[PDB]
């Protein structure tokens, strides 16, 4: 709907999304949940730098978000 | 309406807009949705300085927005 | 009314105003609309050419508005 | 009343005040209106960045305010 | 009451307090009023490092406050 | 539930979590409580900037939170 | 209660706590009051940086708080 841009997050549940953060971080992961604050829960998340690190479950606070690429 | 500046986003649904962000980024895309926080959903979005990177769907958190060119 | 400072924008609708932003930008343009957040819609706007038919400015960026 | 600090602005309506801003600016002008966000309307406003432009009418966003000298 | 920290401000009404600001300023003055945002009204306010800068009445926006010394 | 990202915190009650803060700090501890602001009470908590002290109870203010690793 | 993290502050009333602020300050004193914004009233407070200044009663604005150590 033209007035609910966060509904696009719902269409991406159980896919990999890229959450860009204000501080320049890129957080990629499997979107498990999101709310109207754009808080999100990401499964098996990875931070673009530094790499190698692995996050079974990551809850990202919405206010840190720049944009989400679905 | 002189009291509803965001109604101008409603008249630009499915057009190309440029969202200027507080950090200097320019995001161009087709406006699919917006809410009263100025969250916007941009289809086939593009950010300058990174040309050939393209985002099929970018959900932009309103609090990062400087202004929106319609 | 001494308690409605934003009514000054209502009296400036369809006139040229200058929006000063927190970053030092001066956005000039014709005021079409505003809200209690101080979001504004500016018609035929400039940032001192590069011109914008319609620019919707988010209120939390505003320093002050010259009417 | 001791629970209403912004009533001091009410006692200074139509007098000259100095609005100190977070960024170090000082704005002087005659106080025509204020609200509970500390938004203020200033007539014949001068900013000490230049002492020759008298803005007929300046509306200052309250969240930029450090303090107001009455 | 142990759930109303700002009631301590109430016990300092019409006495001298020091308001520490986020940016490192100290503002001293006689507390006339305060609200739940920690906006405060100060009579005969002085800033510590500007000895001669005197203010008959200063209204301080509370979101600049670090803490208040009573 | 796909609309309740913070329920992942409720499942992590009485387990060890890592709270990443906006300033780069990492706070690690046993999660006893959280709220919809992402305030969290952490028992026997450790700062990686000091991984020797074991604070009996740390209440972290959620507005500082970048993401929590669960 | 697992959804009331600030209740831990209520358990610490009239004991000595240490409030960590975002600017790196540590404020120690006896907790007399708190509220849901994490404003706190600290009696006979001390700041680690300047351990010679007494603060008989300090009201600290919650938005400056990093975490409280109980
Ligand atoms: Ca267009
Ligand atoms: Ca808004
Ligand atoms: Ca306020
Ligand atoms: Ca405002
Ligand atoms: Ca203690």
XYZ file of N, CA, C and O in Angstrom, chain D residues 4-60:
228
model
N 6.150 25.720 35.887
C 5.879 26.282 34.560
C 6.976 27.261 34.152
O 6.734 28.465 34.003
N 8.193 26.769 33.918
C 9.275 27.690 33.521
C 8.997 28.468 32.234
O 9.441 29.617 32.131
N 8.290 27.890 31.247
C 8.042 28.626 30.013
C 7.029 29.761 30.171
O 6.869 30.545 29.234
N 6.354 29.877 31.321
C 5.551 31.073 31.596
C 6.409 32.335 31.637
O 5.901 33.434 31.379
N 7.697 32.210 31.980
C 8.582 33.370 31.891
C 8.613 33.941 30.477
O 8.753 35.153 30.305
N 8.487 33.087 29.453
C 8.391 33.600 28.086
C 7.110 34.404 27.912
O 7.105 35.445 27.247
N 6.020 33.936 28.526
C 4.772 34.680 28.492
C 4.886 36.076 29.080
O 4.265 37.012 28.582
N 5.687 36.241 30.136
C 5.842 37.574 30.717
C 6.724 38.474 29.868
O 6.762 39.681 30.109
N 7.450 37.914 28.904
C 8.343 38.688 28.054
C 7.789 38.885 26.648
O 8.533 39.315 25.757
N 6.518 38.546 26.412
C 5.950 38.739 25.085
C 6.009 40.219 24.746
O 5.747 41.085 25.597
N 6.415 40.515 23.507
C 6.549 41.872 22.982
C 7.714 42.639 23.576
O 7.759 43.866 23.448
N 8.660 41.953 24.214
C 9.910 42.560 24.651
C 11.063 41.929 23.884
O 10.916 40.891 23.236
N 12.232 42.558 23.968
C 13.395 42.037 23.264
C 14.065 40.938 24.090
O 14.255 41.086 25.298
N 14.396 39.820 23.444
C 15.032 38.694 24.119
C 16.220 38.238 23.284
O 16.358 38.597 22.111
N 17.074 37.418 23.905
C 18.198 36.788 23.229
C 18.043 35.281 23.332
O 18.045 34.729 24.438
N 17.919 34.628 22.184
C 17.838 33.176 22.089
C 19.239 32.675 21.777
O 19.770 32.930 20.692
N 19.861 31.992 22.728
C 21.144 31.337 22.488
C 20.895 29.960 21.890
O 20.042 29.218 22.376
N 21.606 29.635 20.820
C 21.416 28.373 20.113
C 22.565 27.414 20.416
O 23.655 27.826 20.831
N 22.295 26.122 20.210
C 23.283 25.084 20.504
C 24.579 25.297 19.724
O 25.669 25.036 20.239
N 24.486 25.763 18.484
C 25.675 25.895 17.651
C 26.520 27.113 17.999
O 27.498 27.386 17.292
N 26.169 27.853 19.052
C 26.887 29.047 19.435
C 26.275 30.349 18.947
O 26.693 31.419 19.411
N 25.297 30.296 18.040
C 24.645 31.517 17.575
C 23.845 32.185 18.691
O 23.377 31.529 19.629
N 23.712 33.510 18.582
C 22.843 34.333 19.414
C 21.859 35.046 18.500
O 22.274 35.710 17.548
N 20.565 34.905 18.768
C 19.543 35.567 17.968
C 18.775 36.499 18.891
O 18.255 36.070 19.930
N 18.728 37.778 18.522
C 17.993 38.783 19.271
C 16.835 39.291 18.432
O 16.942 39.413 17.210
N 15.742 39.610 19.105
C 14.560 40.120 18.442
C 13.435 40.177 19.440
O 13.563 39.728 20.585
N 12.324 40.759 18.995
C 11.160 40.926 19.850
C 10.316 39.663 19.788
O 9.966 39.194 18.696
N 9.980 39.132 20.962
C 9.299 37.849 21.083
C 7.818 38.039 20.795
O 7.112 38.715 21.550
N 7.341 37.456 19.698
C 5.932 37.592 19.343
C 5.097 36.383 19.729
O 3.891 36.532 19.936
N 5.700 35.192 19.830
C 4.958 33.992 20.196
C 5.952 32.903 20.585
O 7.139 32.986 20.266
N 5.454 31.908 21.316
C 6.231 30.734 21.706
C 5.251 29.602 21.983
O 4.067 29.838 22.248
N 5.752 28.366 21.911
C 4.929 27.222 22.292
C 5.686 26.332 23.277
O 6.759 26.715 23.756
N 5.150 25.144 23.579
C 5.736 24.303 24.619
C 6.930 23.490 24.133
O 7.621 22.885 24.957
N 7.192 23.450 22.829
C 8.474 22.964 22.335
C 9.564 24.021 22.401
O 10.694 23.738 21.995
N 9.250 25.224 22.892
C 10.123 26.395 22.836
C 10.388 26.864 21.407
O 11.391 27.546 21.159
N 9.547 26.488 20.436
C 9.521 27.244 19.183
C 9.193 28.699 19.516
O 8.298 28.961 20.319
N 9.917 29.652 18.919
C 9.623 31.068 19.149
C 9.545 31.828 17.819
O 10.245 31.518 16.850
N 8.666 32.824 17.773
C 8.578 33.748 16.645
C 9.193 35.082 17.064
O 8.804 35.648 18.083
N 10.172 35.560 16.293
C 10.967 36.736 16.636
C 10.803 37.783 15.545
O 11.070 37.512 14.370
N 10.356 38.969 15.934
C 10.213 40.076 15.009
C 11.476 40.934 15.045
O 12.069 41.139 16.109
N 11.897 41.403 13.870
C 13.110 42.217 13.710
C 14.319 41.516 14.312
O 15.072 42.078 15.119
N 14.510 40.266 13.884
C 15.546 39.422 14.454
C 16.901 39.788 13.866
O 17.015 40.104 12.676
N 17.921 39.778 14.717
C 19.302 39.975 14.299
C 20.145 38.820 14.812
O 20.004 38.401 15.967
N 21.032 38.313 13.964
C 22.005 37.306 14.372
C 23.381 37.949 14.360
O 23.770 38.575 13.367
N 24.119 37.786 15.461
C 25.421 38.421 15.635
C 26.437 37.956 14.594
O 27.594 38.392 14.619
N 26.025 37.068 13.681
C 26.861 36.752 12.527
C 26.877 37.887 11.507
O 27.792 37.943 10.677
N 25.887 38.782 11.548
C 25.892 39.992 10.730
C 24.898 40.987 11.314
O 23.725 40.653 11.509
N 25.361 42.213 11.558
C 24.619 43.203 12.329
C 23.839 44.183 11.455
O 23.460 45.259 11.930
N 23.585 43.840 10.192
C 22.860 44.733 9.298
C 21.595 44.131 8.708
O 20.697 44.888 8.327
N 21.494 42.811 8.617
C 20.254 42.176 8.191
C 19.323 42.096 9.397
O 19.620 41.406 10.377
N 18.202 42.816 9.338
C 17.124 42.660 10.313
C 16.015 41.867 9.627
O 15.292 42.395 8.777
N 15.899 40.595 9.990
C 14.855 39.725 9.460
C 13.495 40.205 9.931
O 13.243 40.199 11.141
N 12.590 40.606 9.041
C 11.256 41.032 9.514
C 10.608 40.039 10.477
O 9.952 40.452 11.445
N 10.791 38.739 10.248
C 10.089 37.720 11.025
C 10.873 36.421 10.923
O 11.082 35.897 9.819
N 11.295 35.898 12.063
C 12.099 34.684 12.092
C 11.446 33.692 13.039
O 11.086 34.053 14.159
N 11.236 32.462 12.578
C 10.664 31.424 13.426
C 11.765 30.422 13.737
O 12.305 29.789 12.830
N 12.117 30.297 15.008
C 13.247 29.477 15.420
C 12.727 28.151 15.961
O 11.824 28.123 16.809
